[PDB]
């Protein structure tokens, strides 16, 4: 539908996206870059010994720990759900090329038989109900900011003091910018308060994507990842091409003189979009309050933390189906955006605010460098935001957006295939609301626990139960997509929020237990997404603040894995063969070192008083913060201080009062 506008960095429109400083300008022109990461201090992802280690362990662990997942994708036995070839990637060397991000996802949704709006009056009521229940009685709280993160367009600052002004000033001028926007003065809102502009594409890594070995030839094979080229992207796929990127890493010997072991591959790269802080702030200010309501009041379906916690919810179920949404963010419907906005307006949210929100989800995107000799292009015209790319990863409330979309979708699936005897309880907004409120609280024979594209669907004894099994069956045959909204299937080797649901011979939620995902321990330890950035002084700013700390939480996390100790033995053994050293030793040193270094940051920790008071999860997050966006409550207070910094509650309260319908 009408190719999207595109402009070269040279055009004033692009140029106007980066402040006249230094980062900023490097962000514009930054070019394609790849390179072996420093997995751990003084250890390169491609160090021969290391590769040799990866090569041996991968094969070993695979020959001795077959996956145990049944035809319904239920994982049993050893808890292993796939092979260990993920480690065979050359961390730091991305598949060429990355995909250009689609400017419109309408043809896509359509060509997938996905609805371009609620298909039924019932559904429409449900979605709206979710908006009402989610955005209703919020309580103001300070706007927390991640330490080290970038403000992006226009300034690209990593500096907290600055981030705090930017943010504070933003709430000051949010209303004025939104209004500017209501009148269509985009360029004005942007130039005056930097609210608008574009999203800044950055390509993140998937250091472990599927690899399989052909039993016949012994040759290895990596999952093919389709990618759109510019043409295809600026036309929403009506033109251009869609092909497989190349994960072949042979090029590495000839380009870097890097000896590449047989069966190793280039990493998969995911497109990530960093938002314009000025604009996300006013949005975040509402987002977190929303997270608190749902995490509190509808904690049944939305608040998960503790294998036990989760487990306890599932065991009560007669049937637990684990789903799988496909390419969720690219498919997320622009129409849900519009509806959410609509209802919000009806709830009486400040139109200017709704407008900002709306716009945050139509914004152009500046593509950096998806491959050599490629990129530095802005798709979409900021003067008037009209992109339809789905969920932009850097929008201030993308978790909420995916959840709102998905939760309802899941519910509708249950209604559709197993509980028509409930439709009568959803006859208007009021009933719709009461119904959903009940649903989300775990009080219906059809239950759900989820978080965006990750969820488990439940059935208790009741009429729906027989339907439940049919649905489960449908999903197994996988010949028909059960939702009119997204492409859903079952998780083969189902798991939720990282933990694996280990069934027993009974194969019923009743006697199932959540356990760590052994494959995740190895991925995490030998295929990290980021090096350790030893060159960065402030650790709180690093992607991996305290590597060593993981060792501490390890046993707590993966201890109940049926093969936990065997794996460790295996590692140790292979590490010896490759480094002539004790891997365990190594990690303990790192632990000690970090534990000390840690107190240099945390105050309520004597400059030698160590851990103890830390939760396995803190230990988990300090090692890697992308490990809990659950919230600033699932983590020790002294901890958030380490990784976040908030804006005055006084300031947000003032702000919120003006947005809230009341």
Name beta bridge partners: 89: 265
For the chain, the domain total comes to: 4
| CATH code of residue 538 | 1.10.490.60
Question: Crossing angle, helix 398-418 and helix 464-477, to 10 degrees?
Answer: 110
Considering 489, 517, 545, which residue would you say is the last residue of a domain?
Answer: 517
In a domain, 20, yes or no: yes
341 in the same domain as 325 = no
**CA 331 to each of CA 112, 218, 334, 485: distance values in angstroms, whole numbers, following the listed order:** 10, 37, 9, 9
State the CB neighbour count (10 A cutoff) for residue 76. 19
230 in the same domain as 145 = yes
- Which experiment gave this structure? X-ray
In a domain, 580, yes or no: yes
Cis peptide before 154 (omega within 30 of 0): yes
Give the C-alpha separation, 86 to 36, whole Å: 17
Give the C-alpha separation, 288 to 294, whole Å: 10
Give the C-alpha separation, 247 to 251, whole Å: 10
284 in the same domain as 225 = no
Residue 165, classed as helix, strand or coil, is: helix
104 φ/ψ sector (left φ>0, alpha ψ -120 to 50, else beta): beta
Kind plus residue range of the DSSP H or E element containing 233: helix 230-234
Check the annotation: does 256 bind a ligand.
no
411 in the same domain as 389 = no
- Which residue range forms the structural domain that includes residue 661? 607-662
653 in the same domain as 525 = no
567 in the same domain as 511 = no
Name beta bridge partners: 474: none
416 in the same domain as 343 = no
Name beta bridge partners: 231: none
Name beta bridge partners: 44: 38
| CATH code of residue 411 | 3.30.70.1600
599 in the same domain as 546 = yes
119 in the same domain as 20 = yes
| CATH code of residue 643 | 6.20.410.10
In a domain, 96, yes or no: no
Check the annotation: does 184 bind a ligand.
no
Q: After which residues are there C–N gaps above 2.5 Å in the chain?
A: none
Check the annotation: does 490 bind a ligand.
yes
Sign of CA dihedral 589, 594, 600, 602: negative
Give the C-alpha separation, 384 to 119, whole Å: 29
Considering 356, 377, 397, which residue would you say is the last residue of a domain?
Answer: 397
Give the contacts of 500 (CB within 8 A, at least 6 positions apart).
75, 79, 81, 493, 494, 514, 515, 516, 517
Query: What does this entry list as its resolution, in Å?
Result: 3.0
245 in the same domain as 155 = yes
- Relative to beta strand 377-379, strand 211-213 is unpaired
C-alpha distance across the termini of the chain, in Å: 39
253 in the same domain as 184 = yes
């Amino acid at each position: 539908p009408r190719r999207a506008p595109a402009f070269p960095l040279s055009d004033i429109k692009a140029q106007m996206l980066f402040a006249n400083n230094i980062k900023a300008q490097q962000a514009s022109k930054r070019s394609f870059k790849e390179g072996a990461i420093e997995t751990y201090e003084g250890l390169l992802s491609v160090d021969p010994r290391f590769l040799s280690f990866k090569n041996e362990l991968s094969r070993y662990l695979t020959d001795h720990f077959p996956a145990n997942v049944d035809e319904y994708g239920r994982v049993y036995g050893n808890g292993v759900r796939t092979n260990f070839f993920g480690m065979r990637h050359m961390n730091g060397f991305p598949m060429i090329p990355a995909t250009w991000p689609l400017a419109s996802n309408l043809k896509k949704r359509a060509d997938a038989d996905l609805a371009d709006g609620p298909v039924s009056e019932r559904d429409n009521l449900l979605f709206r109900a979710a908006v009402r229940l989610m955005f209703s009685d919020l309580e103001p709280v300070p706007l927390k900011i991640r330490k080290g993160s970038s403000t992006c367009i226009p300034y690209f600052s990593n500096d907290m003091g600055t981030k705090i002004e930017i943010a504070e000033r933003a709430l000051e001028k949010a209303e004025e910018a939104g209004n500017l926007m209501l009148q269509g003065k985009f360029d004005d809102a942007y130039q005056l308060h930097q609210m608008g502009g574009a999203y800044y594409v950055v390509y993140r890594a998937q250091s472990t994507d599927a690899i399989t070995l052909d039993p016949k030839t012994g040759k290895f094979v990596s999952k093919d990842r389709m990618v759109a080229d510019f043409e295809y992207a600026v036309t929403g796929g009506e033109q251009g091409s869609l092909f497989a990127a190349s994960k072949d890493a042979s090029r590495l010997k000839e380009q870097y003189g890097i000896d590449v072991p047989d069966g190793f591959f280039c990493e998969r790269r995911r497109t990530a979009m960093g938002g314009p802080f000025a604009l996300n702030a006013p949005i975040m200010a509402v987002a977190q309050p929303v997270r608190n309501k749902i995490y509190s009041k509808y904690a049944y379906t939305f608040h998960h933390t503790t294998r036990l916690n989760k487990e306890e919810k599932v065991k009560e179920w007669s049937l637990c189906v684990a789903t799988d949404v496909s390419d969720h963010d690219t498919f997320w419907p622009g129409w849900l955006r519009d509806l959410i906005c609509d209802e919000l307006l009806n709830m009486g949210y400040a139109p200017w605010w709704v407008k900002l929100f709306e716009t945050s989800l139509k914004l152009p995107v500046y593509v950096g460098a998806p491959a050599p000799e490629q990129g530095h292009t802005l798709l979409g015209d900021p003067s008037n935001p009209d992109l339809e790319v789905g969920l932009s990863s850097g929008q201030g409330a993308t978790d909420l957006m995916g959840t709102l979309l998905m939760s309802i979708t899941y519910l509708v699936m249950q209604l559709d295939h197993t509980a028509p005897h409930l439709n009568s309880r959803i006859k208007d907004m009021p009933s719709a609301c009461r119904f959903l409120d009940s649903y989300w609280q775990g009080h219906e024979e059809i239950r759900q626990i989820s978080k965006s594209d990750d969820a488990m669907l439940g059935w208790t004894k009741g009429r729906a139960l027989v339907g439940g099994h049919r649905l489960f069956e449908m999903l197994k045959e996988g010949k028909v997509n059960p939702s009119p909204y997204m492409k859903i299937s079952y998780e083969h080797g189902g798991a939720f929020l990282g933990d694996i649901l280990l069934y027993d011979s009974r194969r019923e939620p009743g006697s199932a237990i959540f356990v760590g995902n052994i494959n995740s321990m190895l991925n995490n330890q030998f295929s990290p997404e980021y090096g350790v950035q030893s060159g960065v002084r402030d650790r709180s700013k690093r992607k991996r603040p305290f590597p060593g700390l993981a060792w501490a939480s390890m046993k707590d996390t993966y201890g109940a894995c049926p093969i936990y100790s065997d794996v460790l033995e295996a590692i140790e053994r292979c590490w010896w063969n490759a480094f002539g050293e004790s891997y365990r030793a190594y990690r303990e040193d790192m632990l000690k070192r970090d534990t000390l270094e840690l107190s240099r940051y945390v105050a309520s920790m004597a400059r030698q008083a160590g851990l103890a008071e830390l939760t396995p999860i803190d230990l988990e997050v300090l090692a890697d913060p992308n490990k809990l966006s659950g919230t600033e409550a699932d983590v020790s207070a002294n901890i958030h201080e380490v990784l976040m910094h908030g804006v005055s509650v006084e300031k947000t309260e003032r702000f919120l009062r003006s947005v809230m319908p009341r």
